From a paper:
LysG detects the basic amino acids l-lysine, l-histidine, and l-arginine and activates gene expression of the amino acid transporter encoding gene lysE in the presence of elevated intracellular amino acid concentrations. LysG is a member of the LysR-type transcriptional regulator (LTTR) family, a large and highly conserved group of TRs ubiquitous in bacteria. LysG shows the typical features of LTTRs, a two-lobed regulatory domain linked to the DNA-binding domain by a flexible loop. Two LysG monomers are coupled by dimerization of their DNA-binding domains, forming a winged helix-turn-helix motif responsible for DNA binding.
As no structure of LysG of C. glutamicum was available, we set out to solve the structure of full-length LysG with and without basic amino acids as ligands by single-crystal X-ray crystallography to obtain a sound experimental basis for analysis of effector binding. Interestingly, all attempts to crystallize LysG in the presence of l-lysine and l-histidine failed, but diffraction datasets could be collected to solve the structure of LysG in the free form [LysG], and together with bound ligand l-arginine [LysG + Arg] at 2.52 Å and 3.00 Å, respectively. As is the case for all known LTTR structures, one monomer adopts an extended conformation, whereas the second monomer arranges in a more compact conformation. Binding of l-arginine in the extended protomer of [LysG + Arg] leads to a small but substantial tilt of helix 6 by 8° compared to the conformation in the ligand-free protomer [LysG], which enables coordination of the ligand l-arginine by amino acid residues D124 and E125 in the [LysG + Arg] structure. During size-exclusion chromatography, LysG eluted as a peak representing a molecular mass of 158 kDa. Based on the mass of 34 kDa deduced from the protein sequence, this indicates a tetrameric assembly of LysG in solution.
Numbering used by the authors:
A (entry chain A), B (entry chain B): 0 to 191, 197 to 290
The structure:
């Protein structure tokens, strides 16, 4: 079995940033910190934390750290139950901009109605999102990844549909001899050539790109002719209804979405999951 | 936090039905059971279990029992998660290009024969190699450094010998009055003036340098006359045997080599070390 005192020490090293920080935080000698790490590492057979500052968990160490933060969540829920007061637990979530700007906001209502829980939303790309989940820096995440990261369970939420849209004037500007010049048409991007697959055959030259790093500004730039773009049908629907933009393409792009959460008998985590799933049921496709 | 040992004792009392049942189940005295319960109760401020039989949890005690069963499930799942992640995680080594291109590859055979083990090799100069070891970013390292870095143990692997070689034509091209113009002779380098020490006396002029950042391409450039260079005798032996290059110099340069690994009771690391030592025995000089 794994010594829970030693797990606490590893977590303290990480939370405090160094071995000395864990020493001061835990009121134990530096030798005790070192001895506890040595023992835990010898139990696992791997180095668990970097000897630099700020202290970082290794790949093997991330497992234990994630586990330690799970135990912290159980302890808080337990203390809250005995206490006779609403839990007041901070929930940290990784989410993508497209989910946050379309179907997710109804979750805010649900969380608000609880005791005094708080949300910390992190907007992350796919790779960092999974890393946050792995090391325990978030307890849940909305993601395109279907395979569960270690320590987590996965739930399918439904499918997000993107439409290829542009203003009629912009499309007409890049019509050439009755054929649309996809490569030459300025395009919108959320940040710094897959999007032309099956739209252009030969090699694609350089492309004109505008970058607008917010879901709503991204939609506004498309809406206003700065470029075409792939926009979630939820965002695009009103512009299409208003005739502000048109479909460049009858072929939608569908992206399955998943909710990944710590595997833990957590009543907060169960509750948050229900809220997210219910929102995705109401706002995503089968 | 609540002492998890005490939570186990409370859980055992309920699961076993009496204080004496928890005693035998836990291999502790009835006094030890009582001490833990009383301690847990005063930490909480509530009576947790009846001292009658069968033991019944109070309202607060039902909470801690529920929590204890949650923590038991987490502990078992964590142990299973770590075990599976360790299998997936590659052992990380820092090595220099000269070892990787000569005596090291036989290590691959040994690792391949294990379960489904993986290696991550990092090609590093001497300085970054030792820092990677120090900080825990690699578990082992091939190094010229003989003194053990903190957290690691050292083993001598043997000696690497370098030869100064060139094509016959290149040497003859820079023979003048029977004396070789070392400074004027183009040289090969692995990347961006020690190498002429004991070959030229006074201050050295400019030098003609080609850079080829691969061990094998480095050898090819020498083999093909682009410049002379210091080449591991392992690599140079075939070219010398074929008469493609010659020795510019009977003075070899010998560099003792060492294997440094983190001190950990790991059978994985022990196996890797043995494989490395054995490969070094076959491809380095005593």
């Amino acid at each position: 079995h794994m010594n829970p005192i030693q797990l606490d020490t590893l977590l303290s090293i990480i939370d405090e940033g160094s071995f000395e920080g864990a020493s001061l935080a835990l009121s134990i000698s530096p030798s005790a910190v070192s001895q506890r790490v040595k023992a835990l590492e010898h139990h696992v057979g791997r180095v668990l934390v970097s000897r630099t500052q700020p202290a970082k968990a290794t790949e093997a160490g991330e497992v234990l750290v994630q586990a330690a933060r799970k135990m912290v969540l159980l302890q808080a829920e337990t203390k809250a139950q005995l206490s006779g007061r609403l839990a007041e637990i901070p929930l940290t979530i990784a989410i993508n901009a497209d989910s946050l700007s379309t179907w997710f906001p109804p979750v805010f209502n649900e969380v608000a109605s609880w005791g005094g829980a708080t949300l910390t939303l992190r907007l992350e790309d796919e790779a960092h999102t999974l890393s946050l989940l792995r090391r325990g820096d978030v307890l849940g995440a909305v993601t395109r990844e279907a395979n569960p990261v270690a320590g987590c369970e996965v739930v399918e939420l439904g499918t997000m549909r993107h439409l290829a849209i542009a203003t009629p004037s912009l499309r007409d500007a890049y019509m050439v001899d009755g054929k649309l010049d996809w490569a030459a048409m300025p395009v919108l991007r959320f940040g710094p050539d897959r999007d032309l697959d099956g739209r252009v055959d030969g090699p694609v030259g350089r492309r004109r790109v505008s970058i607008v790093p917010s879901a709503e500004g991204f939609g506004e730039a498309i809406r206003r002719g700065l470029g075409w773009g792939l926009l979630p049908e939820t965002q695009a629907a009103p512009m299409l209804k208003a005739g502000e933009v048109i479909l460049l393409d009858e072929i939608p792009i569908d992206t399955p979405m998943y909710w990944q959460r710590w595997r833990l008998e957590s009543r907060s985590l169960a509750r948050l999951t229900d809220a997210v799933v219910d929102a995705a049921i109401e706002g995503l496709r089968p």
